[PDB]
Amino acid sequence: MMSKPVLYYDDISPPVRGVLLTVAALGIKDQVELKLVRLFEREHLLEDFVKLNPLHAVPVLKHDDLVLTDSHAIIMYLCDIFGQDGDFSLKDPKQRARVHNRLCFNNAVLFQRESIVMRGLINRSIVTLEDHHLKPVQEAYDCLEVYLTNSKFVACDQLTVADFPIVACMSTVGMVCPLSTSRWPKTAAWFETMKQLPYYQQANQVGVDKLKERLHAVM
Amino acid sequence: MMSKPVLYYDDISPPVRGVLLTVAALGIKDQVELKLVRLFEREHLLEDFVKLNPLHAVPVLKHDDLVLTDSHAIIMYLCDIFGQDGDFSLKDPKQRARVHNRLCFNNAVLFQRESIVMRGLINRSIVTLEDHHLKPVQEAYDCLEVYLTNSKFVACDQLTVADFPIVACMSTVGMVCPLSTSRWPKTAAWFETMKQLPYYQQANQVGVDKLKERLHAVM
Numbered sequence: 001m002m003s004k005p006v007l008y009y010d011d012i013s014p015p016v017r018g019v020l021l022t023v024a025a026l027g028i029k030d031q032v033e034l035k036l037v038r039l040f041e042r043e044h045l046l047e048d049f050v051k052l053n054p055l056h057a058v059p060v061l062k063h064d065d066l067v068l069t070d071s072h073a074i075i076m077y078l079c080d081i082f083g084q085d086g087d088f089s090l091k092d093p094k095q096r097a098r099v100h101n102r103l104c105f106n107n108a109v110l111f112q113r114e115s116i117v118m119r120g121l122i123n124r125s126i127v128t129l130e131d132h133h134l135k136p137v138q139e140a141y142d143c144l145e146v147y148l149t150n151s152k153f154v155a156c157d158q159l160t161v162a163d164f165p166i167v168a169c170m171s172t173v174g175m176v177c178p179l180s181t182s183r184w185p186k187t188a189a190w191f192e193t194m195k196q197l198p199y200y201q202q203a204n205q206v207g208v209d210k211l212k213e214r215l216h217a218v219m
Numbered sequence: 220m221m222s223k224p225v226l227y228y229d230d231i232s233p234p235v236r237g238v239l240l241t242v243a244a245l246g247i248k249d250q251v252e253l254k255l256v257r258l259f260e261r262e263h264l265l266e267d268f269v270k271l272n273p274l275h276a277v278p279v280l281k282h283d284d285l286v287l288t289d290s291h292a293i294i295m296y297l298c299d300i301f302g303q304d305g306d307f308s309l310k311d312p313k314q315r316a317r318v319h320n321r322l323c324f325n326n327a328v329l330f331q332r333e334s335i336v337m338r339g340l341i342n343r344s345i346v347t348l349e350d351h352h353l354k355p356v357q358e359a360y361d362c363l364e365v366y367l368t369n370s371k372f373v374a375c376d377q378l379t380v381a382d383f384p385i386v387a388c389m390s391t392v393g394m395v396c397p398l399s400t401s402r403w404p405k406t407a408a409w410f411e412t413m414k415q416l417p418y419y420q421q422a423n424q425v426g427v428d429k430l431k432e433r434l435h436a437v438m
């Protein structure tokens with residue numbers, strides 16, 4: 001009779017996969033109900049979903065009357081109510097701020113730059129990738145490489161929920177802007193490490209593979 | 220001998236002014252030291268600042284060894300350590316998530332759309348504003364109008380720190396995409412309310428006026 005959060009989702013979306021990765025890492029796959037909202041079917045444009053989220057985007061989390069409409073806020077909230085006593089705890093204010101700071105980096109920099117390119121490719125706004133498209137992504141790689149020089153994972157020396165949105169993005173934009181282990185060695189090593197998490201395949205690779213298939217169709 | 224946070228800032232920046240508004244609202248203007256980093260002088264490109272923040276952007280907050288490089292994470296952190304027992308408290312997990320959700324809206328939607336237009340204008344990438352420029356801003360207004368129909372302020376019925384980044388942005392992009400009280404009545408009424416906060420003039424209007432002058436020069 002506990003209230004279960006409901007995650008409105010399409011796992012081709014990197015923001016969605018950041019949450020899926022988080023749900024698995026926190027061990028709460030059984031406490032979060034899923035509700036599929038298929039982007040290529042345009043189910044995010046249905047009147048109910050637009051009423052739920054005027055941004056008409058996934059993911060969305062509904063928990064009782066709480067409606068979160070950004071993967072990054074969903075991730076922090078799931079940590080608060082399910083991860084306070086574990087390895088992903090955000091109880092310490094400086095630790096919470098370190099993690100939040102890198103969530104902001106993903107939301108405002110890395111995913112923004114990935115989505116300009118990916119949205120243009122999907123809607124056929126771009127047919128050929130020019131340097132104007134990939135240079136901002138490589139600048140984001142440069143920043144990530146600095147972060148992963150200063151700590152072992154994106155926000156500190158331990159894995160945190162901030163690694164999950166960034167790796168969801170990294171594994172997506174990587175198909176059009178591949179990581180060079182020589183130019184970004186700390187980032188490549190971190191990427192390889194994250195792919196080895198036991199839940200990486202079901203929480204992130206499935207969705208990447210579906211998007212790769214959609215991109216092969218449009219290119 | 221308490222450690223004072225240091226805010227690296229230029230108040231022409233809406234993200235900076237979201238923090239300045241927060242600092243005043245929390246009553247901590249005396250607990251946060253300021254360090255000016257002038258964008259038009261290119262002080263954000265100096266080697267020290269780039270080492271501090273590879274994104275070479277303001278604001279930055281340094282507190283002991285903690286370095287936050289996004290206004291939205293700075294705002295949440297200042298609430299945690301200075302506002303836990305007051306009217307802007309984020310101690311409740313659902314309240315924190317509501318506020319964080321609208322910070323994400325500002326970081327990922329409203330400010331992103333404001334900055335594409337403002338950056339293009341400043342660097343002369345755009346000389347005339349076309350519908351491709353203002354339509355995404357008006358879509359963001361449509362979402363904000365929904366939020367302000369469901370609650371009195373952006374995140375709930377009380378003023379929260381989420382109102383401050385959004386009003387910093389709103390007062391900036393408003394100079395190129397004016398709010399229509401007939402098309403967005405709840406947003407206009409909220410905007411007028413925020414302008415009446417006693418700290419609005421020094422924390423936000425000064426910086427807007429400087430940017431208006433910079434825009435008059437470039438247009």
Ligand SMILES: N[C@@H](CCC(=O)N[C@@H](CS)C(=O)NCC(=O)O)C(=O)O
Nearest residue numbers: 013015056057058059070071072327
């Ligand atoms: N900042 C948001 C971004 C969400 C987002 O952009 N989702 C995309 C898929 S990657 C979407 O649903 N797009 C549909 C649309 O924009 O109409 C988050 O992290 O949740």
Ligand SMILES: N[C@@H](CCC(=O)N[C@@H](CS)C(=O)NCC(=O)O)C(=O)O
Nearest residue numbers: 108232234275276277278289290291
């Ligand atoms: N998401 C960041 C954005 C910061 C940002 O874009 N700041 C701009 C001024 S509005 C800047 O310093 N730009 C300089 C540059 O990009 O080189 C935040 O909210 O702090």
Ligand SMILES: O=c1c(-c2ccc(O)cc2)coc2cc(O)c(O)cc12
Nearest residue numbers: 012013014039040114115118119172
């Ligand atoms: O934008 C999209 C859509 C999408 C949205 C609406 C629609 O009708 C069909 C596909 C689907 O997957 C994505 C994955 C990304 O990594 C990204 O940056 C953007 C998108």
Ligand SMILES: O=c1c(-c2ccc(O)cc2)coc2cc(O)c(O)cc12
Nearest residue numbers: 231232233258259333334337338391
């Ligand atoms: O981008 C800028 C710069 C800027 C950055 C670097 C520089 O060398 C000179 C001005 C200054 O003020 C801004 C205000 C905004 O509201 C915005 O969206 C973007 C900017």
Ligand SMILES: [Ca+2]
Nearest residue numbers: 030032033034
């Ligand atoms: Ca179930």
Ligand SMILES: [Ca+2]
Nearest residue numbers: 047048049051
């Ligand atoms: Ca309906």
Ligand SMILES: [Ca+2]
Nearest residue numbers: 249251252253
């Ligand atoms: Ca002082």
Ligand SMILES: [Ca+2]
Nearest residue numbers: 266267268270
């Ligand atoms: Ca130096």
